[PDB]
């Protein structure tokens, strides 16, 4: 199911880049790089024993 | 002819024939000693060893231009001594070694400085007194020699190798090997951190980077320790680290160091119990001021 969602995920993502080009044109680039309003890259993973 | 040379003080007399010239017997005697260094018995004979102590004052000053040649002769004698182990023992008994180091530091002749450095490198044997003097020299004399590179590039490379060897030998007993074998290895043992509170703080500095990651690993190892003795050493190290920093004590209490203290806190063994109680008490003392 997740793989099926994959690819369509990138197709949806391309619309964000198109909208950015239409509205703000070129991104901030360099360290800033713009184009991000949410989803800061921070995670939390843990090994869980399932079925032993 | 070692006995003949020892019993014939005519050698020391020709060496003491000052009115003849500055180096008349001295250069001749130095050349004879260098030639006899080919035979290990001649080099290591007590007759040669006896003159080494008598020549200890001559090792220190080389102010005169003639004394510069005398300094080179002394360096050749030093190399000959490095050849013979009994001569090495006599030189260890002989003084002016730190004086020789200072003279080499104040060496106008780069060849003489290179010879002195070569002699020091040939003294690969410990010789704790000269080793400590070189450790004092290594911070200053070796650093200046590296700054004051001159003459042969091969001599400079040899000096760099000698400096690297001196740096390796420095703090050979007080090295990080004990701390690595105790805390890092996971089987706790004698560690520099437990020995001194300053060393404990120094080890904790590397230990606490992200929420005391290395200290957290050590605490996790100590918590699940079947052996009380290794648990005792780990808990003692944890107590020292906690007492080093008050906030660090609270951090350790948050980590498995409190779990390690709770483990074997009042067990049948006494050392483990005492170390765990010390760790817990240090954590509590760091929790509130």
């Amino acid at each position: 199911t997740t793989k099926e969602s994959m690819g369509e995920v990138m197709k949806d993502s391309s619309f964000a880049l198109i909208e950015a080009k239409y509205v703000a044109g070129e991104n901030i680039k360099h360290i800033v790089l713009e184009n991000v309003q949410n989803a800061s890259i921070k995670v939390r993973s843990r090994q869980e024993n399932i079925a032993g | 002819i070692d006995d003949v040379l020892k019993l014939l003080v005519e050698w020391l007399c020709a060496q003491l024939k000052k009115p003849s010239h500055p180096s008349r017997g001295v250069p001749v005697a130095i050349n004879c000693l260098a030639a006899l260094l080919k035979e290990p018995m001649v080099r290591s004979s007590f007759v040669q060893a006896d003159g080494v102590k008598l020549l200890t004052p001559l090792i220190s000053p080389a102010s005169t231009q003639q004394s510069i040649q005398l300094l080179y002769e002394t360096c050749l004698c030093v190399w000959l001594l490095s050849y013979y182990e009994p001569a090495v023992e006599y030189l260890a008994t002989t003084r002016t070694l730190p004086r020789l180091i200072d003279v080499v530091k104040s060496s106008t002749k780069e060849k003489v400085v290179r010879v002195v450095v070569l002699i020091l490198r040939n003294l690969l044997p410990k010789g704790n007194f000269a080793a400590q003097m070189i450790d004092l020299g290594l911070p200053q004399v070796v650093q200046s020699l590296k700054a004051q590179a001159w003459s042969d590039e091969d001599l400079l490379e040899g000096l760099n190798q000698l400096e690297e060897g001196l740096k390796d030998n420095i703090k050979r007993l007080s090295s990080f090997d004990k701390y690595k074998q105790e805390v890092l290895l996971g089987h706790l043992d004698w560690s520099p951190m437990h020995k001194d509170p300053l060393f404990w703080r120094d080890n904790i500095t590397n230990f606490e980077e992200n929420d005391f990651q290395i200290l957290r690993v050590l605490l996790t190892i100590l918590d699940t320790s079947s052996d009380p003795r290794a648990l005792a050493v780990a808990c003692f190290d944890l107590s020292q680290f906690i007492q080093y920093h008050p906030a660090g004590r609270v951090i350790v209490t948050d980590l498995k160091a409190k779990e390690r203290v709770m483990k074997l806190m009042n067990h049948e063994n006494t050392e483990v119990t005492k170390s765990a109680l010390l760790c817990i008490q240090r954590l509590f003392l760091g929790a509130k001021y």
Partner: protein, 107 residues
């Protein structure tokens, strides 16, 4: 913890790097920027084996497996958690090939 790509099409990666904080999974302070195509992306696999496997960053990213040069990370199928990645399009539609997790996931 985090996830560092350090090489990708970077079109969606820049928008997914960071907005407020988290240091973009330390891709700026450490590792490498998500941008790619300037050098060989085999170095991306090397960084994933080095940086992502260093427990700081869980996952990585590679695009379309065509110019991603992800065949170097083909042996990275073992230990999925240190090396897990799926090929998105990001203007370069995914092409199934030997990659970090593509062979295992497809099979």
């Amino acid at each position: 913890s985090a996830l560092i790509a350090m090489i990708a099409d970077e079109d969606t990666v820049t928008g997914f790097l960071l907005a407020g904080v988290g240091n973009v999974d330390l891709r700026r302070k450490t590792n490498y920027l998500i941008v790619d195509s300037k050098t060989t992306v085999k170095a991306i696999e090397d960084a994933f084996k080095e940086f992502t496997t260093k427990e700081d960053i869980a996952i990585v990213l590679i695009s379309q497996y065509v110019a991603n040069m992800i065949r170097f990370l083909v042996d990275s199928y073992n230990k999925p958690i240190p090396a897990i990645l799926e090929i998105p399009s990001k203007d370069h539609p995914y092409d199934p090939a030997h990659d970090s997790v593509l062979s295992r996931v497809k099979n």
